[PDB]
Every structure is written in structure tokens, then in C-alpha cells.
Amino acid sequence: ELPVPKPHQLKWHEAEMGAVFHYDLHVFDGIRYGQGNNRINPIEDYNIFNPTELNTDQWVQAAKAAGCKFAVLTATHETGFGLWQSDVNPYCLKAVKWRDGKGDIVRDFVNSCRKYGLQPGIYIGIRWNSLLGIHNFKAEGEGAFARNRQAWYKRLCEKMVTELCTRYGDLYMIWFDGGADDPRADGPDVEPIVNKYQPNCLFYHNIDRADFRWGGSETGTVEYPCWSTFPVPCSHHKRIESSIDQLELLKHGDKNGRYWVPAMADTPLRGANGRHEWFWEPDDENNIYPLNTLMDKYEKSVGRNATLILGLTPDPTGLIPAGDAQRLKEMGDEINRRFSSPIARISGQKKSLTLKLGKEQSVNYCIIQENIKNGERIRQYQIEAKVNGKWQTVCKGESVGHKRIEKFEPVEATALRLTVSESIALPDIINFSAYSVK
């Protein structure tokens, strides 16, 4: 039997785009983010946290305007501070003067997602905790002290995960910063918690399981071909065969893999001019990616069978900056301009599909989509255009999966033809469409 997505993985492929919102205490410190420093220098005064104009509806609407279907918030990251009303991590919103210690930004956030029709997910950082002395999943120290403290920390994390999985409705994903390591060793035993309380939630990830994989870079792209199948049911370097070039495997997948671990692409929005910022920092207004760059990334992520996650940055007032929001809207508008209305479209469970265009006209893009619930069946394909009554090949490829965007030098054509020359089962093509884009 062909590998196929589990039922709860269909929403991963179908979403195509989502957003992650990073927010922690250092956003309010008036200086740039230094990751190395932040992980090992506990915050001096947590009352710098004071987003007096906080509005998670504005965050969600801003992401939605780009085409995002899901949105994720960092409940914790590296400081140890938690953006919810926790009864186990005292270093949370209960501690601060803002909102009289009764704020719960995770709640505001999941409510906003649902209000606008985006599926909410939660990111949890357990790998680094500057307050509590955790570095690369490990409680610092030695001997009985460290063994006992590690056992305690694992339970603390289990309890935090339990709160987040039981008090905020059904979640799209749980994303752990760098995963949740190994439950038989330093990592918390979180998979059973997510399975019990969040059976349809994407679990991302630990040594035993990843419901999707990081595509090998934060460029907002994957490589080509890009398959959803994978040799192991996780993305952990300790579980991939030792002779494999692992980054190449993340970037491409393994067409012969027996596990469904589909590709994720990600990038901060604020990645221009030599910056690469997951958090809001001063003087980065003009470092948002241009629309043309975002479109290149879209075509090389969503158009290469990977769901794309954009990193968005609420500011110290509690809002997505105006410029960022405008750029996001421009991205969504441009995706719609290019691809919402094809010249023609056709579908079928066939190895060949001919798209008649109605009249001779210009064509420079095609979209092909397989019915992903039934697997990646297409292994080799070609697209031909009928130009002056003669078929000529305009492109060739391998993987299709959920979505393939092909762009080629424009031709005046009366028809396009998709031929699947190699396949492991009868292709189930839900979309073969042509476009003319200037």
C-alpha cells in the first residue's frame, strides 16, 4: 500500500500557508535580539512587558490578508516566561503589572484565530530557559541535584503542555523549539499528552515523531523535487541513517520513504537587507521582504509541495506594525492576482490530461495538484503546449504532491497537455490549470 497522510495531516497540506508570532520579554528591551545572550542571561525586569495596545485580532487579520490559514503563538521561547495564566510556571502573565496579572495572550490569540477563521496552534520552547537554568534541554549541574532537577523539569514541561492542550480548544499544531528531544532521556514525555487531549493536532516534534519536517533552511523555500515521504517517522538526526546527507533529505524528502513527514518551509518576514528577524527589534521597519521576493518564495514553497510559515513580529505596543501588515496584504493580493482565476482547468484520474484553452493565447504558468489523501503517485511528468498546431514541451518535473507551480517562457498556445510518464499508481489529479501572468 502507498504511504498516505493520516487524516489529521490533510489540513497541513491544504492550509498551504500559515504564520508564527514570536513574542517574549526582550521585545520590550529597546535593543536588538541576541539569541546567544538571551538564552543564558535571565531577564532583569519582566515589567518591561507592557503592550498597552495589544490586539490579537489585528495580528490574525494581518496574517489572514497574506493567505495564512493557521497561526501559531510562542507561549514560551527562551526566557522561560509564559504568555498565559499558568498554575505551574509562575513566570507567566500572573507575575506582571500589565492587565493586573490577569492577562492571557494565548487565550486572546486562539480566540482571535477562530474569530477570523484561522486554525490556532501553539509553540512551546522547552529547550532553553534562562530563568530556570535549562540549556539544550538540560538542567545545569551534576549528580543527584541534576538528575532530580531534570526529572522535575520534565514534569514541569509535561504540566505546561497539559495546560496548553486542555484549556484553549482544539489546536492545529504544537510546535516545540528544536523539538522536545527524547522522552527516555532529557526530554519531557509529551507525545502521550498531545495524543490524549489533542488527537487531531499536528505533533512537531521529538525523537519518536514529527508530523511534518523542517525543510532544511529558513529561506521560505524547499528544494526540488520535494516529496512528503520520509525514511523514518521523525526528522531527528539520531533516527536518520548515518550515511544520509540529512539536510538534503530535509530539503527533498525520500520518494521511497514509508512514512508521511511532509515538508515545511519557513522564513521571517523581516529578512531583507542582511537581517533575519523572528522577533520585533528597533529600526527593522524597512527590513521586511519585498513583495517580489515573497512571491519567489511562495512559488518555491507552496509551489514545491511545502506549506510555508511566515514569521511575524508584534511590536512593544502589541500590534503587527503597519508596514508589515501592508506587505502581507500585498502578498495575498498578488497570490490572488496570479492564481485565483485560470485560463482553463481540468481534473481526472488519468496519466494524460489535455487542457483546451478556447482560443490561441499566451500562457506562462501551470498548476498541478494531486489528491494528497491518496499519496504522491506522480514520479515523472511533462507539460506540452500546442503552438502553431504542434506540441512542444514547456517543462518537465518529478514530484507534484499537493501543489506544483510551474513557470516557463510564455507561448501562444491553443492547448496544454500534462503527461505523467512514470507513476506508482493511477494519478488522481484534482487540478491541472493554465495561467497568463505578466
Q: Are 343 and 361 in contact (CB under 8 A)?
A: yes
Choices 8-16, 140-148, 173-181, 411-419 (CB under 8 A): range interacting with its own copies: 140-148
- The answer to whether 350 and 84 have CB atoms below 8 angstroms apart is no
The only residue of 139, 194, 222, 416 in contact with its own copies, by rule CB under 8 A: 139
- Using alpha carbons, list the distances in angstroms from residue 434 to 8, 147, 418: 30, 61, 11
From candidates 42, 231, 332, 410, binder to its own copies by CB under 8 A: 42
List Cβ neighbours of 139 (8 Å cut-off, separation of 6 or more): 132, 133, 146, 149, 150, 152, 153
88 binds, among its own copies, Na ion, none (CB under 5 to 8 A by kind): its own copies
Rounded Cα distance between 286 and 290, Å, is 9
What minimum distance in Å lies between the beta carbon of 28 and its own copies?
A: 15
Exactly one of 14, 53, 87, 245 binds its own copies (CB under 8 A); which one?
Answer: 87
Question: Helix, strand or coil for residue 121?
Answer: strand
CA dihedral 314, 319, 320, 321 (to 10 degrees): -110
Figure out which of the listed residues 4, 8, 29, 354 binds Na ion, where binding follows CB under 5 A. 29
Of 27-35, 65-73, 291-299, 405-413, the segment contacting Na ion by CB under 5 A is: 27-35
Q: Which of 2, 30, 32, 97 binds its own copies (CB under 8 A)?
A: 97
Window 291-350: residues binding Na ion (CB under 5 A): none
What burial class does residue 391 get, using C-beta atoms within 10 Å of its C-beta: 0-12 exposed, 13-18 middle, 19+ buried?
Answer: middle
Inter-residue long-range contacts of 147-153, CB under 8 Å, 24+ positions, other chains counted: 150/186, 153/188
Q: For residue 134, give Cα distances in angstroms to 40, 126, 378.
A: 9, 8, 46
- 178 is an interface residue for its own copies by CB under 8 A: no
CB of 128 to its own copies, least distance (A): 10
Least spacing, CB of residue 319 vs Na ion, in Å: 16
Contact by Cβ (8 Å): 174, 202: yes
Name every residue whose Cβ is closer than 8 Å to that of residue 136 and which is 6 or more positions away in sequence. 127, 128
Chain length of the chain: 438
Binding mask of the shown chain, residues 215 to 254, with x at each position contacting its own copies by CB under 8 A: ----------------------------------------
From 1-9, 134-142, 188-196, 203-211, give the range in contact with its own copies by CB under 8 A: 134-142
How many Å apart are CA 94 and CA 11, to the nearest integer? 34
Among 13, 26, 251, 417, the residue binding Na ion under the rule CB under 5 A is 26
Q: Which stretch binds its own copies (CB under 8 A): 68-76, 128-136, 289-297, 387-395?
A: 128-136
Sheet containing strand 213-214, edge to edge, reads 202-204, 173-176, 119-124, 70-74, 17-21, 307-312, 263-268, 213-214
26 binds, among Na ion, its own copies, none (CB under 5 to 8 A by kind): Na ion
Least Å distance between CB 131 and its own copies?
A: 7
Among 142, 241, 283, 409, binds its own copies (CB under 8 A): 142
Identified binder of its own copies from the candidate list 35, 152, 258, 421, rule CB under 8 A? 152
DSSP state of 289: P
Q: Which residues bind Na ion (CB under 5 A)?
A: 26, 29
Q: Which residues bind its own copies (CB under 8 A)?
A: 39-42, 44-47, 87-88, 90-92, 94-95, 97, 101, 130-133, 135, 139-142, 144-146, 148-149, 152, 155
